[PDB]
Amino acid sequence: MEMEKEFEQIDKSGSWAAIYQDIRHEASDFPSRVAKLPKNKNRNRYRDVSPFDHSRIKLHQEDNDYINASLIKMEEAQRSYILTQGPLPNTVGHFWEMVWEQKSRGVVMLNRVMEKGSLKCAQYWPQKEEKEMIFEDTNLKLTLISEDIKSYYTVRQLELENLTTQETREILHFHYTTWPDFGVPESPASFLNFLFKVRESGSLSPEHGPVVVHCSAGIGRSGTFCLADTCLLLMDKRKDPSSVDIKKVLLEMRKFRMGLIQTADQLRFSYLAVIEGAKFIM
Ligand SMILES: CCc1cc2c(=O)[nH]cnc2s1
Q1: Residue from 187, 236, 281 to probe ligand 1 pocket by mutation (most atoms less than 8 Å from CB)
Q2: Cα distances (angstroms) measured from residue 7 to each of 127, 196, 226, 272
Q3: Ligand 1 centre from 280 Cα, in Å?
Q4: Which residue among 22, 143, 198, 275 is least enclosed by CB atoms within 10 Å?
Q5: Are 43 and 67 in contact, with CB atoms under 8 Å apart?
Q6: Integer Cα distance of 46 and 51 in angstroms
Q7: What are the pocket residues of ligand 1 if the criterion is a CB atom closer than 6 Å to any ligand atom?
Q8: Residue ranges of domains in the chain, CATH in brackets
Q9: Active site includes 226?
Q10: Per residue, what are the HEC states of 68-108?
């Protein structure tokens, strides 16, 4: 079926939970043996969210190459994304090592450091220009260059230096700051505006490594971001845009990382975002 009328048909019939459970039943199951090794317990935020072995990002290190991060490669859309958990106190150096080694231009953050009164990720970037951060375990230096605070999101320019080679690179940090503590946003308008700002920066384009996107677990809000982006790109590429099947795209992405889209409300919100976004594109 088309999207917008499939949408109204699920609303009127109140069957979002059944649709979402079907997706959960059909989703791929691949091994995640490296994630579960005992030496990696303090590298995982949640015991039930792990990268598959076949698509995990490897650190260029011979001691321990493990990080909780996955490469999502979308062949028809010609887009790639790295989805990862919010960094932990003992993985902030690994996080920036990955950004460096994978040649990423942008980092997309969809959570606040504290939500619901608890810490959802480490304070992994510097908050003042004159107070830079050094990650001694991976030999990187990170400096805040500039910060632009808007009503729904903040953009930061960061400098990452590889202290071993003295090479430097400019990284863009796109921080969506207004996702509510409970539920999903009422309108997708500010989320779509944010997606378009990431796109306009070059951070999603083939001349760079894959964008790094995270929330707390790296599957829920993060899944909504890449699912909406890929669906809108396919609607632009194909002769028949109504042939884009959001459930099929989501199942394809779940071949690369488990659990993408965590609730039936996130599923409904993803439909809403793609529907509204397709009108603005034209
Ligand atoms: C001025 C260009 C824009 C495109 C776009 C979109 O596709 N979705 C949401 N906001 C915008 S702004």
Answers
A1: 281
A2: 42, 23, 20, 8
A3: 6
A4: 22
A5: yes
A6: 11
A7: 192-193, 196, 277, 280-281
A8: 1-282 (3.90.190.10)
A9: no
A10: EEEEEEECCCCEEEEEECCCCCCCHHHHHHHHHHCCECEEE
